[PDB]
Design a protein around this ligand. Structure first.
Ligand SMILES: CC(C)(COP(=O)(O)OP(=O)(O)OC[C@H]1O[C@@H](n2cnc3c(N)ncnc32)[C@H](O)[C@@H]1OP(=O)(O)O)[C@@H](O)C(=O)NCCC(=O)NCCS
Ligand SMILES: CC(=O)NCCc1c[nH]c2ccccc12
Ligand SMILES: CC(=O)NCCc1c[nH]c2ccccc12
Length: 210
């Protein structure tokens, strides 16, 4: 038995503690790199919280057993200066992940897919406690956001998935691929950066229109 609840400002430390236990260690790119201590990812994870659309799954003892951290993304202004996230990162392993994200954004802009949309919900960090996996918690976290979207006239939910495994979960939830890139094809300086196990394949950006 668990609840799905809005993540509050006072929850920051508990969210970080949960992510350090799971996501930091067991998201495929993090585990490939052996991310280790990463204060900059802690910072990254806390950033979307004040948008008031991030959710926690909580067990009967009051422990966080899952999170989906979401942020609002706004269409770039016509005079927008695209910034590289990797430029403000000291941690070398996390910088590799941020560089990958920058590269995806250079190749694919979600706002091109939806020219009429000013605001899109961005699913940034999804993590479920191992002992609670395969119970549909990812789906219940995701679906709690639909309510926020409906309450605020947001039509599109955008989620970058770091493995075909997690992209499949999003497909079950009614998302579809809008962009993909094989790890074998990601060679920003001429050589492969990420070589996780073959079934991961690469990144897939997933979208749902609600
Ligand atoms: C991706 C993740 C959030 C899914 O959460 P979840 O709540 O377990 O999602 P689901 O319940 O829908 O289970 C997904 C699939 O995992 C498999 N599964 C079943 N039991 C499982 C278990 N005990 N442990 C792990 N996976 C299991 C099943 O294939 C299941 O699909 P199905 O139930 O439709 O047959 C979770 O695996 C996770 O935290 N992964 C590591 C971090 C990560 O990669 N996050 C996503 C980045 S995009
Ligand atoms: C919805 C979701 O969790 N996407 C995953 C993106 C991701 C993979 N590795 C990371 C390391 C640090 C920050 C983000 C990531
Ligand atoms: C269109 C399609 O079949 N997607 C699923 C498999 C796949 C092909 N290339 C990828 C690159 C990254 C992730 C997944 C993939």
């Amino acid at each position: 038995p668990y609840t799905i609840e809005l993540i509050q400002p006072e929850d920051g430390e508990a969210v970080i503690a949960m992510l350090k236990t799971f996501f930091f260690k067991d998201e495929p790119l993090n585990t490939f790199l052996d991310l280790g201590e990463c204060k900059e990812l802690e910072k990254y994870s806390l950033k979307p919280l004040p948008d008031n659309c991030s959710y926690k799954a909580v067990n009967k003892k009051g422990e966080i057993i899952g999170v989906f951290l979401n942020g609002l993304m706004r269409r770039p202004s016509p005079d927008d200066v695209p910034e590289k996230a990797a430029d403000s990162c000291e941690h070398p392993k996390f910088k590799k992940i941020l560089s990958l994200m920058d590269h995806v954004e250079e190749q694919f802009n979600i706002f091109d897919v939806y020219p009429d949309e000013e605001l899109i919900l961005d699913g940034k960090i999804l993590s479920v406690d191992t002992n609670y996996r395969g119970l549909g918690i990812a789906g219940r976290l995701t679906e709690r956001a639909y309510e926020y979207m409906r309450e605020n006239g947001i039509n599109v939910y955008h989620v970058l998935c770091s493995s075909h495994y997690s992209a499949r979960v999003m497909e079950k939830l009614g998302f579809h691929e809008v962009f993909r890139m094989q790890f074998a094809d990601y060679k920003p300086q001429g050589e492969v950066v990420f070589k996780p196990a073959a079934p991961h394949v690469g990144i897939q950006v997933m979208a749902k229109e609600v």
